[PDB]
């Protein structure tokens, strides 16, 4: 029967955690970025956000169909009551999870640590972020473990504006020697969806917007029509 409200909130939270972990473990070869979930009466729609769509839908829409089953058979939904779709996130370098997965993939292919980190930092700079720092920790050369990080741009480490202004992702990459940890942290620009431009006022940080100054005519006499 029905349960209490706080328990329903906790249950949907644990379901979201289940789903995110499952799609990170399963969709670890496509490049996994995130998930959105929307609810209407007895219709729950889940969207997997990833950089490659033609690769995640699969042949004739196989995987996208199959996922439904492994949702339906697990989450306990009534038959045919779960729908799920696939759209591509507009940008890639501004999602810390996506770039952490990219770095993990590059280290999975044997590409060296420093050049892979340089590539991802250059991508993030070209992505439009005003700062990124990535750390690869563990064994890179030798028996002992080095924590090697590159930081460029700006990055806040304190205060509230580190949740809605910094994206952080932690991932692990296995190796014949052990496990390497990848921490990717990204700054975000001011206005939503990657600084489209000023919109309805939702101020979140200090800025000096300087408009064009008024200009007077040089000619002693005024305009004539």
């Amino acid at each position: 029967v029905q349960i209490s409200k706080k328990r329903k909130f906790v249950a949907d939270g644990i379901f979201k955690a289940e789903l995110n972990e499952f799609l990170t473990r399963e969709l670890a070869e496509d490049g996994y970025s995130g998930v959105e979930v929307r609810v209407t009466p007895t219709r729950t729609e889940i969207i997997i956000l990833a950089t490659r769509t033609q690769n995640v839908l699969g042949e004739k829409g196989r995987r996208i169909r199959e996922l439904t089953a492994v949702v339906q058979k697990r989450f306990g939904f009534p038959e045919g009551s779960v729908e799920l779709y696939a759209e591509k996130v507009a940008t890639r370098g501004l999602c810390a999870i996506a770039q952490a997965e990219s770095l993990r993939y590059k280290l999975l292919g044997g590409l060296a640590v420093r050049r892979a980190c340089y590539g991802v930092l250059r991508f993030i700079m070209e992505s439009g972020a005003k700062g990124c720092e990535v750390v690869v920790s563990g064994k890179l050369r030798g028996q002992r473990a080095k924590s090697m990080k590159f930081v460029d741009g700006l990055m806040i480490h304190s205060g509230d504006p580190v949740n809605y202004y910094v994206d952080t992702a932690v991932r692990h990459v296995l190796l014949r020697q052990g496990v390497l940890g990848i921490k990717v942290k990204i700054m975000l620009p001011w206005d939503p969806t990657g600084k489209i431009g000023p919109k309805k006022p939702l101020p979140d940080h200090v800025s000096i917007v300087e408009p064009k100054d008024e200009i007077l005519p040089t000619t002693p006499i005024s305009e004539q029509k």
Partner: peptide, 27 residues
């Protein structure tokens, strides 16, 4: 520029392999 020997040296600038890495970096 070769980065592999640079990283190997930067991990330990005075290790067992420091002389060889520094010599390889010279030229």
């Amino acid at each position: 520029f070769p980065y592999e020997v640079s990283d190997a040296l930067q991990d330990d600038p005075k290790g067992k392999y420091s002389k060889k890495l520094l010599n390889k970096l010279v030229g």
